Design a protein around this ligand. Sequence first.
Ligand SMILES: OC[C@H]1O[C@@](CO)(O[C@H]2O[C@H](CO)[C@@H](O)[C@H](O)[C@H]2O)[C@@H](O)[C@@H]1O
Ligand SMILES: OC[C@H](O)c1ccc2ccccc2c1
Length: 443
Amino acid sequence: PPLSFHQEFLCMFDSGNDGADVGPFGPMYHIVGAWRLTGGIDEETLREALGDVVVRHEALRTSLVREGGTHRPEILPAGPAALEVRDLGDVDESERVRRGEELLNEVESTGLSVRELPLLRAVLGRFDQKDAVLVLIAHHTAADAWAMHVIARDLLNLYAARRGNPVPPLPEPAQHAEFARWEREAAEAPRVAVSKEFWRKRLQGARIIGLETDIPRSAGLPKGTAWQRFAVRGELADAVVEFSRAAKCSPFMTMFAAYQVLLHRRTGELDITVPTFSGGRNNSRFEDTVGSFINFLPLRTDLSGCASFREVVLRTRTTCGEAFTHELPFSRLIPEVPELMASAASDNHQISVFQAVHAPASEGPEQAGDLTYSKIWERQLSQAEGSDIPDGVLWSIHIDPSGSMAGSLGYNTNRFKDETMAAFLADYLDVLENAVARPDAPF
Ligand SMILES: OC[C@H]1O[C@@](CO)(O[C@H]2O[C@H](CO)[C@@H](O)[C@H](O)[C@H]2O)[C@@H](O)[C@@H]1O
Ligand SMILES: OC[C@H](O)c1ccc2ccccc2c1
């Protein structure tokens, strides 16, 4: 298979081939998922299920190897089924949550090479016979967040069937290579021309907003990515969810709008372009498919003349609607507007991305056979050296149906001080709070 458009996007953010094993085709560019498991576990059989999962999805066997400047995919035969198990200790709940977070951090702090199998690893942390945390980590070229939920769903299903516990049959998945074919086929349609023309004009003169770094690029400090984690307080999250319902906008639009307000106060800019990642899974043929589908999507909003936070949210809604309506794979949009990324590689600025995690919606614990499992979203333990961000700043929020929000601000430690970002995050939460408290107040 060829690289997908998303993997082509990542190539733009590659490190080149000069010494250091970093960036998105390096071993720190991974994604984790943690699930709380209730019920007795047969570790042997779970390990076998993990083998089944990797056999099932080609993307989890598709290494990427350096091939003269670029990266070549190669689908490999599944390697040995492997599972690490740790006894975390039979302790009180709050200590279980803590030791669980520490395990997640530890796993995310370790490398996982894309150049050879495995591309997925699993660590099971058992508290007692009937309570555990299951941690999956996958190279982020192979899996996005949605794909991690597919992997978990499949895994626990295949485990149950091996145990002889009744479970519904799994659908036959499409493979990511079939998606890769399809997106390229799709990108030759007449519709695409109209969309390229829409973008060429919409983004004329546009520059993704750059944030001034504390440490310049040319300092050459070693690449690292830190993650400051937070949960939106319940009263605040309720306010956001309620405001959004009444405004007829999504909670994402409201949070993004607050970010635009924050960038205005810090940069003075009124013409604000900020990329998000869309989920990139509008084609439901691929909902059972493991792969990384997400798509870099520039959102340009003109804030000039806004008389209130409500107006900001409404312009944002307009921007997102047209953006999703005309969405292109970014590696087929960027040629039309090549100066859009100027501040990305500048010596004293980096771009930021503001996203909502795209994941299957679940109300509460799920069941597969004799196990109950639920996803862990809220991590409050921050992390000094975790999953790689190729070259920038990432805001990432997961918005639960329940209304609760788990977020991260990730940044490169070779470019930003920890205290700078802590202040940035605190500013963001303060802007968000005043905004929804007083959405119609004048500026
Ligand atoms: O990103 C929101 C929220 O989700 C968690 C849950 O583990 O992290 C996921 O999203 C991060 C950003 O995309 C990834 O780096 C991470 O691998 C993935 O698990 C949080 O820790 C975060 O606050
Ligand atoms: O899930 C998105 C991923 O963490 C990512 C990939 C490329 C980026 C490029 C610039 C800034 C942030 C990025 C984040």
